[PDB]
Amino acid sequence: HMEMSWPYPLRSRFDPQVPEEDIDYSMTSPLNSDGSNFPCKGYQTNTPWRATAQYTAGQTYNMTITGSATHGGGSCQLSLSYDNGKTFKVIQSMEGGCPLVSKYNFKIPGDVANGQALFAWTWYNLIGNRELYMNCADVVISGGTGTPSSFESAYPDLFVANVGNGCSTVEGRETVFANPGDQVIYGGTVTPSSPAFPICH
Ligand SMILES: *[C@@H]1O[C@H](CO)[C@@H](O)[C@H](O)[C@H]1NC(C)=O
């Protein structure tokens, strides 16, 4: 039962600009098991475009995660989409121990693309039902040397499981991504030597 509290995601209770009627007061719910609200609970399609962060390529920022239960930790990614959620590319993986701290730093790579993006937090809980948690924020990127094409070629695809796609996490096993990218935080029982798990086809 956690949600992204900074930068403010779509329909966030924490964002003063969201009209009372549009706030998702149950944002800590996991994504639907059948994939019917993947990605971003579908909010990228039906919410006004309004940036809640301005990110400069090469600079470091923090995001925050807030809630009432950490389900023993797990693994997260932070990702960017330049096509309003058709494709997500990973800029940081937190393998193990996520979210046992409520603040993570991350560097925006130099070769990101510029303009409107979605910034997505994904979380795979360690203990309990096999869920995916996902919130997306509208953000604007500046000062990158990439294009959406060069960025999409150079970075890993978002790890997607527990949304009815034949790929599942496994209770009691740390989620260690096959493709984590070069910006990795290790926590819980995961080390740089831990094998990738699960393996999806
Ligand atoms: C870090 O997060 C806090 C919210 O906890 C926010 O006010 C601040 O602007 C963020 N700073 C950076 C550099 O991202």
Residue numbers in the entry: 1 to 201
Question: Can you quote the paper on this entry?
Answer:
Here, we report structural and functional characteristics of a single-domain AA11 LPMO from Aspergillus fumigatus, AfAA11A. Using a single copper ion cofactor, bound in a highly conserved so-called histidine brace, LPMOs carry out oxidative cleavage of glycosidic bonds using molecular oxygen (O2) or hydrogen peroxide (H2O2) as a cosubstrate. For chitin-active LPMOs, only C1-oxidizing activity has been reported. The catalytic activity of AfAA11A on chitin increases when supplying reactions with hydrogen peroxide, showing that, like LPMOs from other families, AfAA11A has peroxygenase activity. These results show that, in stark contrast to the previously characterized AfAA11B from the same organism, AfAA11A likely plays a role in fungal chitin turnover.
The structure of AfAA11A was solved by X-ray crystallography, and a complete structure was obtained, which, however, lacked a bound metal ion in the histidine brace. Of note, except for one GlcNAc attached to Asn62, the structure of this N-deglycosylated protein showed no other signs of N-glycosylation or O-glycosylation. The structure of AfAA11A shows a typical LPMO fold with a core composed of β-strands that are connected by several loops and a few short helices. The axial copper coordination positions are occupied by the hydroxyl group of Tyr133 and the methyl side chain of Ala69. Relative to AoAA11, AfAA11A has an insertion spanning residues 16 to 26, which contains a surface-exposed tyrosine, Tyr25, in a position similar to that of Tyr27 in CBP21 (SmAA10A), a chitin-active AA10 (38). Because of the Tyr25-containing insertion that is unique for AfAA11A, the substrate-binding surface of this enzyme shows features that are characteristic for chitin-active AA10 LPMOs, such as CBP21, in particular the presence of exposed Tyr25. Interestingly, both AA11 enzymes as well as CBP21 contain a small pocket close to the histidine brace, which has been previously associated with chitin-active LPMOs.
